[PDB]
Design a protein around this nucleic acid. Structure first.
Ligand SMILES: [K+]
Ligand SMILES: [Mg+2]
Ligand SMILES: [Mg+2]
Ligand SMILES: [Mg+2]
Ligand SMILES: [Mg+2]
Ligand SMILES: [Mg+2]
Ligand SMILES: [Mg+2]
Ligand SMILES: [Mg+2]
Ligand SMILES: [Mg+2]
Ligand SMILES: [Mg+2]
Ligand SMILES: [Mg+2]
Ligand SMILES: [Mg+2]
Ligand SMILES: [Mg+2]
Ligand SMILES: [Mg+2]
Ligand SMILES: [Mg+2]
Ligand SMILES: [Mg+2]
Ligand SMILES: [Mg+2]
Ligand SMILES: [Mg+2]
Ligand SMILES: [Mg+2]
Ligand SMILES: [Mg+2]
Ligand SMILES: [Mg+2]
Ligand SMILES: [Mg+2]
Ligand SMILES: [Mg+2]
Ligand SMILES: [Mg+2]
Ligand SMILES: [Mg+2]
Ligand SMILES: [Mg+2]
Ligand SMILES: [Mg+2]
Ligand SMILES: [Mg+2]
Ligand SMILES: [Mg+2]
Ligand SMILES: [Mg+2]
Ligand SMILES: [Mg+2]
Ligand SMILES: [Mg+2]
Ligand SMILES: [Mg+2]
Ligand SMILES: [Mg+2]
Ligand SMILES: [Mg+2]
Ligand SMILES: [Mg+2]
Ligand SMILES: [Mg+2]
Ligand SMILES: [Mg+2]
Ligand SMILES: [Mg+2]
Ligand SMILES: [Mg+2]
Ligand SMILES: [Mg+2]
Ligand SMILES: [Mg+2]
Ligand SMILES: [Mg+2]
Ligand SMILES: [Mg+2]
Ligand SMILES: [Mg+2]
Ligand SMILES: [Mg+2]
Ligand SMILES: [Mg+2]
Ligand SMILES: [Mg+2]
Ligand SMILES: [Mg+2]
Ligand SMILES: [Mg+2]
Ligand SMILES: [Mg+2]
Ligand SMILES: [Mg+2]
Ligand SMILES: [Mg+2]
Ligand SMILES: [Mg+2]
Ligand SMILES: [Mg+2]
Ligand SMILES: [Mg+2]
Ligand SMILES: [Mg+2]
Ligand SMILES: [Mg+2]
Ligand SMILES: [Mg+2]
Ligand SMILES: [Mg+2]
Ligand SMILES: [Mg+2]
Ligand SMILES: [Mg+2]
Ligand SMILES: [Mg+2]
Ligand SMILES: [Mg+2]
Ligand SMILES: [Mg+2]
Ligand SMILES: [Mg+2]
Ligand SMILES: [Mg+2]
Ligand SMILES: [Mg+2]
Ligand SMILES: [Mg+2]
Ligand SMILES: [Mg+2]
Ligand SMILES: [Mg+2]
Ligand SMILES: [Mg+2]
Ligand SMILES: [Mg+2]
Ligand SMILES: [Mg+2]
Ligand SMILES: [Mg+2]
Ligand SMILES: [Mg+2]
Ligand SMILES: [Mg+2]
Ligand SMILES: [Mg+2]
Ligand SMILES: [Mg+2]
Ligand SMILES: [Mg+2]
Ligand SMILES: [Mg+2]
Ligand SMILES: [Mg+2]
Ligand SMILES: [Mg+2]
Ligand SMILES: [Mg+2]
Ligand SMILES: [Mg+2]
Ligand SMILES: [Mg+2]
Ligand SMILES: [Mg+2]
Ligand SMILES: [Mg+2]
Ligand SMILES: [Mg+2]
Ligand SMILES: [Mg+2]
Ligand SMILES: [Mg+2]
Ligand SMILES: [Mg+2]
Ligand SMILES: [Mg+2]
Ligand SMILES: [Mg+2]
Ligand SMILES: [Mg+2]
Ligand SMILES: [Mg+2]
Ligand SMILES: [Mg+2]
Ligand SMILES: [Mg+2]
Ligand SMILES: [Mg+2]
Ligand SMILES: [Mg+2]
Ligand SMILES: [Mg+2]
Ligand SMILES: [Mg+2]
Ligand SMILES: [Mg+2]
Ligand SMILES: [Mg+2]
Ligand SMILES: [Mg+2]
Ligand SMILES: [Mg+2]
Ligand SMILES: [Mg+2]
Ligand SMILES: [Mg+2]
Ligand SMILES: [Mg+2]
Ligand SMILES: [Mg+2]
Ligand SMILES: [Mg+2]
Ligand SMILES: [Mg+2]
Ligand SMILES: [Mg+2]
Ligand SMILES: [Mg+2]
Ligand SMILES: [Mg+2]
Ligand SMILES: [Mg+2]
Ligand SMILES: [Mg+2]
Ligand SMILES: [Mg+2]
Ligand SMILES: [Mg+2]
Ligand SMILES: [Mg+2]
Ligand SMILES: [Mg+2]
Ligand SMILES: [Mg+2]
Ligand SMILES: [Mg+2]
Ligand SMILES: [Mg+2]
Ligand SMILES: [Mg+2]
Ligand SMILES: [Mg+2]
Ligand SMILES: [Mg+2]
Ligand SMILES: [Mg+2]
Ligand SMILES: [Mg+2]
Ligand SMILES: [Mg+2]
Ligand SMILES: [Mg+2]
Ligand SMILES: [Mg+2]
Ligand SMILES: [Mg+2]
Ligand SMILES: [Mg+2]
Ligand SMILES: [Mg+2]
Ligand SMILES: [Mg+2]
Ligand SMILES: [Mg+2]
Ligand SMILES: [Mg+2]
Ligand SMILES: [Mg+2]
Ligand SMILES: [Mg+2]
Ligand SMILES: [Mg+2]
Ligand SMILES: [Mg+2]
Ligand SMILES: [Mg+2]
Ligand SMILES: [Mg+2]
Ligand SMILES: [Mg+2]
Ligand SMILES: [Mg+2]
Ligand SMILES: [Mg+2]
Ligand SMILES: [Mg+2]
Ligand SMILES: [Mg+2]
Ligand SMILES: [Mg+2]
Ligand SMILES: [Mg+2]
Ligand SMILES: [Mg+2]
Ligand SMILES: [Mg+2]
Ligand SMILES: [Mg+2]
Ligand SMILES: [Mg+2]
Ligand SMILES: [Mg+2]
Ligand SMILES: [Mg+2]
Ligand SMILES: [Mg+2]
Ligand SMILES: [Mg+2]
Ligand SMILES: [Mg+2]
Ligand SMILES: [Mg+2]
Ligand SMILES: [Mg+2]
Ligand SMILES: [Mg+2]
Ligand SMILES: [Mg+2]
Ligand SMILES: [Mg+2]
Ligand SMILES: [Mg+2]
Ligand SMILES: [Mg+2]
Ligand SMILES: [Mg+2]
Ligand SMILES: [Mg+2]
Ligand SMILES: [Mg+2]
Ligand SMILES: [Mg+2]
Ligand SMILES: [Mg+2]
Ligand SMILES: [Mg+2]
Ligand SMILES: [Mg+2]
Ligand SMILES: [Mg+2]
Ligand SMILES: [Mg+2]
Ligand SMILES: [Mg+2]
Ligand SMILES: [Mg+2]
Ligand SMILES: [Mg+2]
Ligand SMILES: [Mg+2]
Ligand SMILES: [Mg+2]
Ligand SMILES: [Mg+2]
Ligand SMILES: [Mg+2]
Ligand SMILES: [Mg+2]
Ligand SMILES: [Mg+2]
Ligand SMILES: [Mg+2]
Ligand SMILES: [Mg+2]
Ligand SMILES: [Mg+2]
Ligand SMILES: [Mg+2]
Ligand SMILES: [Mg+2]
Ligand SMILES: [Mg+2]
Ligand SMILES: [Mg+2]
Ligand SMILES: [Mg+2]
Ligand SMILES: [Mg+2]
Ligand SMILES: [Mg+2]
Ligand SMILES: [Mg+2]
Ligand SMILES: [Mg+2]
Ligand SMILES: [Mg+2]
Ligand SMILES: [Mg+2]
Ligand SMILES: [Mg+2]
Ligand SMILES: [Mg+2]
Ligand SMILES: [Mg+2]
Ligand SMILES: [Mg+2]
Ligand SMILES: [Mg+2]
Ligand SMILES: [Mg+2]
Ligand SMILES: [Mg+2]
Ligand SMILES: [Mg+2]
Ligand SMILES: [Mg+2]
Ligand SMILES: [Mg+2]
Ligand SMILES: [Mg+2]
Ligand SMILES: [Mg+2]
Ligand SMILES: [Mg+2]
Ligand SMILES: [Mg+2]
Ligand SMILES: [Mg+2]
Ligand SMILES: [Mg+2]
Ligand SMILES: [Mg+2]
Ligand SMILES: [Mg+2]
Ligand SMILES: [Mg+2]
Ligand SMILES: [Mg+2]
Ligand SMILES: [Mg+2]
Ligand SMILES: [Mg+2]
Ligand SMILES: [Mg+2]
Ligand SMILES: [Mg+2]
Ligand SMILES: [Mg+2]
Ligand SMILES: [Mg+2]
Ligand SMILES: [Mg+2]
Ligand SMILES: [Mg+2]
Ligand SMILES: [Mg+2]
Ligand SMILES: [Mg+2]
Ligand SMILES: [Mg+2]
Ligand SMILES: [Mg+2]
Ligand SMILES: [Mg+2]
Ligand SMILES: [Mg+2]
Ligand SMILES: [Mg+2]
Ligand SMILES: [Mg+2]
Ligand SMILES: [Mg+2]
Ligand SMILES: [Mg+2]
Ligand SMILES: [Mg+2]
Ligand SMILES: [Mg+2]
Ligand SMILES: [Mg+2]
Ligand SMILES: [Mg+2]
Ligand SMILES: [Mg+2]
Ligand SMILES: [Mg+2]
Ligand SMILES: [Mg+2]
Ligand SMILES: [Mg+2]
Ligand SMILES: [Mg+2]
Ligand SMILES: [Mg+2]
Ligand SMILES: [Mg+2]
Ligand SMILES: [Mg+2]
Ligand SMILES: [Mg+2]
Ligand SMILES: [Mg+2]
Ligand SMILES: [Mg+2]
Ligand SMILES: [Mg+2]
Ligand SMILES: [Mg+2]
Lengths: 249, 122
RNA sequence: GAGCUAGCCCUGGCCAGGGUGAAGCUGGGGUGAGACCCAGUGGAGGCCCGAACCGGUGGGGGAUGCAAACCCCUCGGAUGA
RNA sequence: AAGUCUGGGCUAAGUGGUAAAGGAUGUGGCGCCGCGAAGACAGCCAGGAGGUGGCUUAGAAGCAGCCAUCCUUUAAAGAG
RNA sequence: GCAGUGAACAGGCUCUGGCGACUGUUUACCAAAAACACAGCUCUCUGCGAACUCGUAAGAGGAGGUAUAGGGAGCGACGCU
RNA sequence: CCUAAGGUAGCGAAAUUCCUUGUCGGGUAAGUUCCGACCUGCACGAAAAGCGUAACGACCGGAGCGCUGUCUCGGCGAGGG
RNA sequence: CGAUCAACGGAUAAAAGUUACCCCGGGGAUAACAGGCUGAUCUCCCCCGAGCGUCCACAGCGGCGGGGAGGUUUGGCACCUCGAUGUCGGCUCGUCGCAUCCUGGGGCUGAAGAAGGUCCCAAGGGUUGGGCUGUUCGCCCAUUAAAGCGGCACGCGAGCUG
RNA sequence: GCUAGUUGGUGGGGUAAUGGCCCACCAAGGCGACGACGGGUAGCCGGUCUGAGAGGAUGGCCGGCCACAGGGGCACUGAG
RNA sequence: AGCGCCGGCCAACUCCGUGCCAGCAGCCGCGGUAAUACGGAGGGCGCGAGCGUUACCCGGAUUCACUGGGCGUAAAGGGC
RNA sequence: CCGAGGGUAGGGCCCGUGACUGGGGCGAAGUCGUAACAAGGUAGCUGUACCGGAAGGUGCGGCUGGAU
RNA sequence: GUAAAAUGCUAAU
RNA sequence: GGCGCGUUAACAAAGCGGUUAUGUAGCGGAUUGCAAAUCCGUCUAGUCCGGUUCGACUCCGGAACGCGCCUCCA
């Protein structure tokens, strides 16, 4: 949580080429704010538009307290301005989404052989007196989940027991990777949603040099400073309305 | 003499028409069920929208047997079908009516609501 | 050595009984004429059922056999290559 | 077939007559310390306290985890 | 009369997959099948003393046939390919 | 990058799928088989044809009804031994 | 002088496969079954006590290591048997072992009761019927006091099945 | 496309009374694009609502008629 | 004495709040920092023991056209 | 005899539901291309046929609702 | 009759 | 497990005992209203460990991972 490093997933929202450009404005804003926090950044996945923006950027913020600070950015950020892609001079309202994820463990997976039952038995099919009399077939059962793997690929119980455990581990792992991925998915959709013009967490109105965080009501007018990284006023104001939410009973 | 695979008519209004005994609930391995014994059964045939439906695994008490029942007085009684009344795990009937005669052995085995509901006790 | 067996050649013989009912023909309808429809007649077919005859499906028996391939029940073909 | 032979000792497990780490007031024999009528060891009979806790902990306040383990009448009483 | 093809001879049925179109054929004597064959499709050879086959040859088959024919090969009713 | 060129239609856990009793659905009280789907087809695929197909089959699967000494579970009787 | 006659004391100048259509002569000199020896693998039991268990090593557990038992599995070896020791499963008929699934007797419990956990004694008896698959095994259904695990040539084909 | 009491006849049965209403038999007829048969829906009208009217919609109360009396069938009694 | 309404249709408007949010909506459409269109307020309009909404029928719909419509290119001449 | 109904067997119609599958309508942003509207850069459209990620392309015949 | 190198441009009166 | 092949930069992929591979991308410029296309330039390397050699991406041995083939008579 709060003290671990953080992954920030910036994705273009409704807006097309201008959402992607604004996504890069949100991108540069976070990289700078990281510097003014002693935090280290590193880009893991970048999808540039030939216009200069990013349809998606994923980067980590490395340093004690990253998920503590950056966590208040997960949501939909609305831009209202005259796009560089606009030619009739109109104001368009585009969106970009920010997703904040605490950095994960690549925790290694190994089998607790004490929760694994190994059955040996006669195999099936050809073999003559061999297949009739040999306990070459192996079933391995993951007793907690109940899933089993069977192998009679070879004549050897030892080789078949090894291949069975291999496949069993590979299948449990794919289950464990799938749970964490479904958990990641729901978490992500909670923060990002559809990315529609509603759902917004913060507005950046360039005509009015206004930056409004409709979660707490904090408005500033240093839109240039905000976009240059100076986000600390908003965070603290969010941080304080957070603690004022934690006034109980 | 009922056993697994035996078909029984349902002498009540639960919706079930034919049940197939799958177990004789009388100890570890009773071979046979007679009047007043409970069985587990599969509901093989039912009328639409009844309480129980086809596929349900139900309990019932056997009320009539084609194998005659012998009685301490030297008499016997025999029915034209094998019939059972579907009950719950508390031995109470699940329907509200009992169709046809039932064996008086049900009384002495604590199936009094069923005996009551039955139009004749023989 | 083809008196067993396989194929072919020549010349004879055999296939109870029952069932289905093609074409055609006749009549009627239909049309400009037709197609075609209907009924009757008709008797086609590696058509149907089933003996003989030719087989040998499943099971049982037999296993120093009645028999070095049989017996019983059952079963396939039976106008056709 | 030839000693119920002789002398000294050990074993009580039928060990002898089927095995290991390891465990044990089994038994016998050695040592080498130590404490003892400055009355020992065991039992019994008192005292065995206090400022009362010091960090963390609404009590853990002598008798959780942490910190070091000050001192009085004293014959001896650890903030155990 | 319990019972009338009163004895004997005389289909159990249905739903749904695979394979093979079908009737046929086969390992005499452990396999009858999804195997072989089959009409049908295609490729190919062959102008006639044909090609091809048997034979050292002569001579035969092909065929007393002639490319709508004869040999060889694969595929295997039919449908859509 | 490589190849002569990189499997089309149709079909697919299949007479083909190792993992496999794949997964989902159906049927069952309960279905490693069966049927219908799905498609990462270990290792289908177009005359060693591909995919279908009415009818046919002593072919090989799956299910139900009928009926039963197959069975629970055995009993008695007959005749040849 | 001409040899990767390199299978290097070099069969010809000149040589690949397949057989489940197979055959003969041999071998238990040598594999596959079973036995045997062994016991790495397998199964079971201990030692140590790091740590878990709010507290508390030891109710229940046991890091890193250590010592054994058994002779069900998978192997190693190739010792009787290749002038034959018929091999899976099922069926039938059992009998033995006990490391005990149940029932009987117990100690400890983080045992209120009830119900369990764990270990000890105990082999007298008992240990069901189904769906799937040839299956052994395993899963599932419905029950049960319980639905034990092993040996007997993985018991039993001059007993049956196939 | 529908039709076997189906459509007609004759003779009867039944009814207060006509009739295939029912029956035996004779004939092979009867209905249908002017919609038979089947399916859906609906008790019908006086009236009511609306509409410039024509139309449309509708059938609640009130009046008239029909139909039904838990779901079905049946006859007895009776002027009914 | 209350209820509906005051962008246009449609009779009745100004102020603050809000800032494509909250919301309005029968149709055309309102709301993205000077909203007669959202919310309130004041003011106004319409009805009144009612005022609105929802459902449904006729109307407006000559939009099934008999009264009372159409078919070259808008939907619409049958290939002959 | 007829007969409520019950039972047995086979049909018909309708409804709901079904692993999976087919396309369809919709969307203030996505990926691919650019078929049509200007000889829309190959006049277009057309019935049909074959083919291709996709719009489409091409063949045959028709139309002008085709350009200069 | 001949005559075209060349794809694209979201979304706010 | 046996046998064969491989590991190079951003990706794909080569040669080489001494030496900008290459294509595409990326990066600076041009062009364009802008993007693409196009034009001018430009660029990051050899899986680990140990040997041979003056010198190893290149050769030898091992490891690690990946690919391909085989594992039959019971
Ligand atoms: K062989
Ligand atoms: Mg523009
Ligand atoms: Mg184990
Ligand atoms: Mg085996
Ligand atoms: Mg099998
Ligand atoms: Mg073999
Ligand atoms: Mg073995
Ligand atoms: Mg029911
Ligand atoms: Mg059913
Ligand atoms: Mg069902
Ligand atoms: Mg009941
Ligand atoms: Mg009854
Ligand atoms: Mg002859
Ligand atoms: Mg002869
Ligand atoms: Mg003759
Ligand atoms: Mg004949
Ligand atoms: Mg005849
Ligand atoms: Mg005949
Ligand atoms: Mg005849
Ligand atoms: Mg007949
Ligand atoms: Mg005739
Ligand atoms: Mg004639
Ligand atoms: Mg004629
Ligand atoms: Mg005729
Ligand atoms: Mg005939
Ligand atoms: Mg005749
Ligand atoms: Mg015939
Ligand atoms: Mg026949
Ligand atoms: Mg017949
Ligand atoms: Mg024959
Ligand atoms: Mg025979
Ligand atoms: Mg014969
Ligand atoms: Mg038989
Ligand atoms: Mg026999
Ligand atoms: Mg026999
Ligand atoms: Mg014999
Ligand atoms: Mg003999
Ligand atoms: Mg015979
Ligand atoms: Mg005979
Ligand atoms: Mg016979
Ligand atoms: Mg016959
Ligand atoms: Mg016959
Ligand atoms: Mg026959
Ligand atoms: Mg016949
Ligand atoms: Mg005949
Ligand atoms: Mg003939
Ligand atoms: Mg003595
Ligand atoms: Mg002496
Ligand atoms: Mg002892
Ligand atoms: Mg002894
Ligand atoms: Mg001893
Ligand atoms: Mg009589
Ligand atoms: Mg018959
Ligand atoms: Mg069949
Ligand atoms: Mg199929
Ligand atoms: Mg199948
Ligand atoms: Mg055949
Ligand atoms: Mg065949
Ligand atoms: Mg076929
Ligand atoms: Mg066919
Ligand atoms: Mg054929
Ligand atoms: Mg076919
Ligand atoms: Mg025949
Ligand atoms: Mg026949
Ligand atoms: Mg034979
Ligand atoms: Mg033979
Ligand atoms: Mg023979
Ligand atoms: Mg035979
Ligand atoms: Mg065969
Ligand atoms: Mg045979
Ligand atoms: Mg046959
Ligand atoms: Mg054959
Ligand atoms: Mg054929
Ligand atoms: Mg053909
Ligand atoms: Mg031809
Ligand atoms: Mg030819
Ligand atoms: Mg010759
Ligand atoms: Mg010759
Ligand atoms: Mg000649
Ligand atoms: Mg001649
Ligand atoms: Mg020919
Ligand atoms: Mg053939
Ligand atoms: Mg063939
Ligand atoms: Mg074929
Ligand atoms: Mg392939
Ligand atoms: Mg192709
Ligand atoms: Mg094609
Ligand atoms: Mg395909
Ligand atoms: Mg598949
Ligand atoms: Mg399956
Ligand atoms: Mg298939
Ligand atoms: Mg395959
Ligand atoms: Mg499989
Ligand atoms: Mg398999
Ligand atoms: Mg399963
Ligand atoms: Mg199911
Ligand atoms: Mg069913
Ligand atoms: Mg299933
Ligand atoms: Mg089976
Ligand atoms: Mg299937
Ligand atoms: Mg798959
Ligand atoms: Mg094939
Ligand atoms: Mg071929
Ligand atoms: Mg093949
Ligand atoms: Mg081919
Ligand atoms: Mg097929
Ligand atoms: Mg067809
Ligand atoms: Mg077929
Ligand atoms: Mg067929
Ligand atoms: Mg056949
Ligand atoms: Mg045949
Ligand atoms: Mg056959
Ligand atoms: Mg069956
Ligand atoms: Mg059955
Ligand atoms: Mg049956
Ligand atoms: Mg018997
Ligand atoms: Mg007897
Ligand atoms: Mg006798
Ligand atoms: Mg050599
Ligand atoms: Mg040599
Ligand atoms: Mg040599
Ligand atoms: Mg030498
Ligand atoms: Mg030589
Ligand atoms: Mg030479
Ligand atoms: Mg050689
Ligand atoms: Mg040879
Ligand atoms: Mg072979
Ligand atoms: Mg073979
Ligand atoms: Mg032979
Ligand atoms: Mg031979
Ligand atoms: Mg021979
Ligand atoms: Mg031999
Ligand atoms: Mg031999
Ligand atoms: Mg020999
Ligand atoms: Mg040797
Ligand atoms: Mg020897
Ligand atoms: Mg051996
Ligand atoms: Mg070996
Ligand atoms: Mg061996
Ligand atoms: Mg051996
Ligand atoms: Mg061995
Ligand atoms: Mg053995
Ligand atoms: Mg051995
Ligand atoms: Mg032996
Ligand atoms: Mg051992
Ligand atoms: Mg040992
Ligand atoms: Mg060991
Ligand atoms: Mg031990
Ligand atoms: Mg602890
Ligand atoms: Mg404790
Ligand atoms: Mg351990
Ligand atoms: Mg050890
Ligand atoms: Mg040991
Ligand atoms: Mg042993
Ligand atoms: Mg031993
Ligand atoms: Mg052994
Ligand atoms: Mg062994
Ligand atoms: Mg030996
Ligand atoms: Mg030796
Ligand atoms: Mg031997
Ligand atoms: Mg002998
Ligand atoms: Mg001997
Ligand atoms: Mg012998
Ligand atoms: Mg035993
Ligand atoms: Mg014990
Ligand atoms: Mg236990
Ligand atoms: Mg006990
Ligand atoms: Mg006890
Ligand atoms: Mg207790
Ligand atoms: Mg308790
Ligand atoms: Mg206890
Ligand atoms: Mg104990
Ligand atoms: Mg016991
Ligand atoms: Mg079954
Ligand atoms: Mg079974
Ligand atoms: Mg089994
Ligand atoms: Mg198994
Ligand atoms: Mg118990
Ligand atoms: Mg239990
Ligand atoms: Mg069981
Ligand atoms: Mg055995
Ligand atoms: Mg056994
Ligand atoms: Mg045996
Ligand atoms: Mg035998
Ligand atoms: Mg056996
Ligand atoms: Mg024996
Ligand atoms: Mg024997
Ligand atoms: Mg014996
Ligand atoms: Mg013997
Ligand atoms: Mg067999
Ligand atoms: Mg057999
Ligand atoms: Mg009549
Ligand atoms: Mg009538
Ligand atoms: Mg008549
Ligand atoms: Mg009706
Ligand atoms: Mg109705
Ligand atoms: Mg009007
Ligand atoms: Mg009306
Ligand atoms: Mg009524
Ligand atoms: Mg009522
Ligand atoms: Mg009534
Ligand atoms: Mg009534
Ligand atoms: Mg109003
Ligand atoms: Mg106004
Ligand atoms: Mg003012
Ligand atoms: Mg309003
Ligand atoms: Mg309105
Ligand atoms: Mg706004
Ligand atoms: Mg304002
Ligand atoms: Mg404004
Ligand atoms: Mg305002
Ligand atoms: Mg509004
Ligand atoms: Mg309004
Ligand atoms: Mg307002
Ligand atoms: Mg009033
Ligand atoms: Mg209206
Ligand atoms: Mg009108
Ligand atoms: Mg008019
Ligand atoms: Mg008009
Ligand atoms: Mg015209
Ligand atoms: Mg037209
Ligand atoms: Mg037409
Ligand atoms: Mg009736
Ligand atoms: Mg009826
Ligand atoms: Mg439906
Ligand atoms: Mg275009
Ligand atoms: Mg075009
Ligand atoms: Mg253009
Ligand atoms: Mg173009
Ligand atoms: Mg064009
Ligand atoms: Mg065209
Ligand atoms: Mg083309
Ligand atoms: Mg038009
Ligand atoms: Mg041009
Ligand atoms: Mg130009
Ligand atoms: Mg272009
Ligand atoms: Mg694009
Ligand atoms: Mg576009
Ligand atoms: Mg390996
Ligand atoms: Mg390289
Ligand atoms: Mg690379
Ligand atoms: Mg290259
Ligand atoms: Mg090279
Ligand atoms: Mg380069
Ligand atoms: Mg470049
Ligand atoms: Mg550039
Ligand atoms: Mg390197
Ligand atoms: Mg070096
Ligand atoms: Mg080096
Ligand atoms: Mg270098
Ligand atoms: Mg290297
Ligand atoms: Mg190397
Ligand atoms: Mg293998
Ligand atoms: Mg071999």
């Amino acid at each position: 949580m709060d003290e671990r490093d953080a992954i920030v997933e910036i994705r273009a929202g409704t807006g097309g080429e201008e959402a992607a450009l604004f996504a890069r404005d949100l991108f540069n804003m976070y990289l700078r704010f990281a510097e003014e926090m002693g935090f280290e950044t590193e880009v893991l996945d970048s999808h540039p538009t030939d216009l200069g923006g990013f349809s998606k950027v994923v980067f980590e913020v490395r340093g004690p307290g990253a998920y503590g600070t950056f966590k208040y950015e997960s949501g939909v950020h609305r831009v209202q301005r005259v796009p560089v892609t606009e030619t009739q001079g109109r104001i368009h309202t585009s969106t970009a989404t920010v997703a904040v994820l605490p950095k994960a463990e690549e925790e290694d997976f190994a089998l607790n052989m004490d929760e694994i039952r190994i059955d040996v038995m006669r195999a099936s099919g050809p073999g003559g007196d061999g297949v009739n009399t040999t306990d070459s077939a192996v079933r391995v059962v993951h007793l907690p989940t109940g899933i089993m793997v069977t192998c009679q690929d070879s004549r050897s119980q030892i080789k078949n027991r090894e291949k069975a455990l291999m496949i069993l581990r590979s299948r449990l792992l794919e289950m464990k990777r799938a749970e964490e991925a479904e958990r990641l998915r729901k978490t992500r959709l909670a923060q990002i949603g559809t990315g529609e013009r509603s759902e917004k967490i913060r507005t950046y109105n360039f005509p009015q040099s206004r930056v409004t965080d409709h979660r707490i009501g904090f408005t500033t007018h240093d839109l240039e400073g905000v976009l240059s990284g100076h986000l600390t006023p908003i965070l603290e104001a969010l941080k304080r309305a957070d603690q004022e939410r934690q006034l109980a009973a | 003499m009922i056993q697994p695979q035996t078909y029984l008519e349902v002498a009540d209004n639960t919706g079930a028409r034919k049940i197939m005994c799958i177990r004789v609930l009388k100890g570890s391995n009773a071979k046979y069920a007679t009047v007043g014994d409970v069985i587990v059964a599969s509901v093989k045939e039912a009328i639409p929208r009844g309480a129980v439906k086809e596929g349900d695994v139900v309990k019932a008490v056997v009320v009539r047997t084609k194998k005659e029942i012998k009685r301490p007085d030297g008499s016997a009684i025999r029915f034209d079908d094998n019939a059972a009344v579907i009950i719950n795990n508390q031995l109470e009937p699940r329907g509200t009516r009992v169709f046809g005669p039932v064996a008086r052995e049900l009384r002495e085995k604590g199936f009094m609501k069923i005996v009551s509901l039955a139009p004749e006790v023989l």
